Amino acid sequence: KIKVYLYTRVSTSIQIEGYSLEAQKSRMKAFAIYNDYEIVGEYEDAGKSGKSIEGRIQFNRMMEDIKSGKDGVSFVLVFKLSRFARNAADVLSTLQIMQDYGVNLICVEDGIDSSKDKLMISVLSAVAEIERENIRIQTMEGCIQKARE
Amino acid sequence: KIKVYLYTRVSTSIQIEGYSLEAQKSRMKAFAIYNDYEIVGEYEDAGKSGKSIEGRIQFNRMMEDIKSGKDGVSFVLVFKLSRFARNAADVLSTLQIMQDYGVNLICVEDGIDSSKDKLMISVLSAVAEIERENIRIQTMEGCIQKARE
Numbered sequence: 001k002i003k004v005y006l007y008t009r010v011s012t013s014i015q016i017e018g019y020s021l022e023a024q025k026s027r028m029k030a031f032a033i034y035n036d037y038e039i040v041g042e043y044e045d046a047g048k049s050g051k052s053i054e055g056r057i058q059f060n061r062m063m064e065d066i067k068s069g070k071d072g073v074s075f076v077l078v079f080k081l082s083r084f085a086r087n088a089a090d091v092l093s094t095l096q097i098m099q100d101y102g103v104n105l106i107c108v109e110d111g112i113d114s115s116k117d118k119l120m121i122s123v124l125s126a127v128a129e130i131e132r133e134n135i136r137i138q139t140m141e142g143c144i145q146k147a148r149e
Numbered sequence: 150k151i152k153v154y155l156y157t158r159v160s161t162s163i164q165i166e167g168y169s170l171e172a173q174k175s176r177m178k179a180f181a182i183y184n185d186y187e188i189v190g191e192y193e194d195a196g197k198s199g200k201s202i203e204g205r206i207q208f209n210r211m212m213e214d215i216k217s218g219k220d221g222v223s224f225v226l227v228f229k230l231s232r233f234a235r236n237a238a239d240v241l242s243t244l245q246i247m248q249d250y251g252v253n254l255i256c257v258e259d260g261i262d263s264s265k266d267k268l269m270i271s272v273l274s275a276v277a278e279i280e281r282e283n284i285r286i287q288t289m290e291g292c293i294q295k296a297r298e
Contacts, residue, residue, distance in 0.1 A: 011282060012289070052293075053286065081275040087283070088237065088276050110275045112268070119261070123272045126230040126259045127237050133160060134236070137202065140161070144201075 001038040004075040004106075007062060009083055010047035010054050021046060024079040031108050032077065040071040063094075066101050073103055080109040089128040092121070150187040153224040153255075156211060158232055159196035159203050170195060173228040180257050181226065189220040212243075215250050222252055229258040238277040241270070 006028050010017035021044075032039050043062040047054035065071065076098065078084040084107070085091035095105055095114060104115040114120055155177050159166035170193075181188050192211040196203035214220065225247065227233040233256070234240035244254055244263060253264040263269055 011286060052290065080278065081272075082278045082282050085279065087279060091276065091279075107275065110271055112271050112275060117268070119266070119268055120272055122259055122261050123230075123269055124276070126256065126261060127240065127273070127276055129229065129231045130234065130236060130240075133231050137160060141201065 001036060002075065003040045003071060003073045004032060004037045004077055005041040005043060005062060005065075005071070005073050006032070006039055007043050007059065007076050007078050007084065009045035009059070011082070012053055013047040013051075015047075017047060024083070028077050028079060028108050031106075037075070037077075040073060041065065063097065066098060066103050069101070075104050075106050075115070077106045077108055080107050081112070087128075087131055088124055089131055092124040092128050095121070095124070150185060151224065152189045152220060152222045153181060153186045153226055154190040154192060154211060154214075154220070154222050155181070155188055156192050156208065156225050156227050156233065158194035158208070160231070161202055162196040162200075164196075166196060173232070177226050177228060177257050180255075186224070186226075189222060190214065212246065215247060215252050218250070224253050224255050224264070226255045226257055229256050230261070236277075236280055237273055238280055241273040241277050244270070244273070 006025070008021055008024055008028070010021065014021075025042075029039070031037075041062070043058040045054050045056060045058045049055070062076070066073065066076075081091055084105075085094060098105060099114070104113070106113050112120070155174070157170055157173055157177070159170065163170075174191075178188070180186075190211070192207040194203050194205060194207045198204070211225070215222065215225075230240055233254075234243060247254060248263070253262070255262050261269070
């Protein structure tokens with residue numbers, strides 16, 4: 001059977017968002033079942049620490065386990081991209097490293113599967129260029145302003 | 150022959166970016182030629198007004214001409230997505246309206262062609278969800294702050 005890892009997270013905290021994590025996980029496990037996948041790892045940044053926005057620790061543990069080939073996984077399943085990456089440049093670099101190491105991405109709710117693609121990479125790269133240029137424009141406007149003060 | 154419109158713009162002003170507009174346009178015309186397209190309109194927001202960031206007037210004229218069916222165009226050619234939209238939610242809604250009215254998008258430099266797709270729409274929608282949620286998080290953090298003042 002095709003081997004997969006499950007990855008789940010909250011954006012803010014478990015207080016605010018925890019309640020829908022288990023509905024996400026159940027959904028992802030059902031999908032695993034219907035597609036005859038074998039789950040060999042589950043990783044979760046559940047927002048259980050006392051800060052406002054959740055970090056990325058288990059996500060980083062997952063990526064080391066991917067790099068190492070430990071479990072021989074073909075996919076990471078996420079609920080959707082916004083429960084995986086913080087912006088387009090993030091989605092892109094993470095996806096590129098994953099595929100470097102033989103691993104594709106399935107977003108269960110979005111219906112996106114990167115192995116059925118390289119159009120996904122082109123769009124993401126194109127949208128990451130939008131974000132970078134927005135940052136340059138903000139920096140340029142900020143230099144104009146610091147120039148009056 | 151397949152009929153197309155060309156669309157070009159600067160992000161900031163013609164002063165800063167104008168110089169590479171004509172290299173873009175030449176490229177786009179060459180592409181039109183090699184692909185045996187027939188150009189039936191050219192629209193340009195060239196950043197010739199006296200403001201910092203360029204607007205969207207000719208782009209808006211183009212979209213009315215698309216809605217009206219005037220010229221019977223099958224594609225809009227842009228140089229790349231960042232010379233077309235301001236963020237992912239923008240790329241998505243514009244692309245959806247265009248296709249509503251029978252029109253697809255070719256990004257000459259990115260090599261993206263929306264008619265060869267609906268994976269493009271799914272990714273864009275997924276990345277637009279990232280942006281929306283970033284906005285909600287910023288608004289929530291801002292309410293926390295206004296609550297101390």
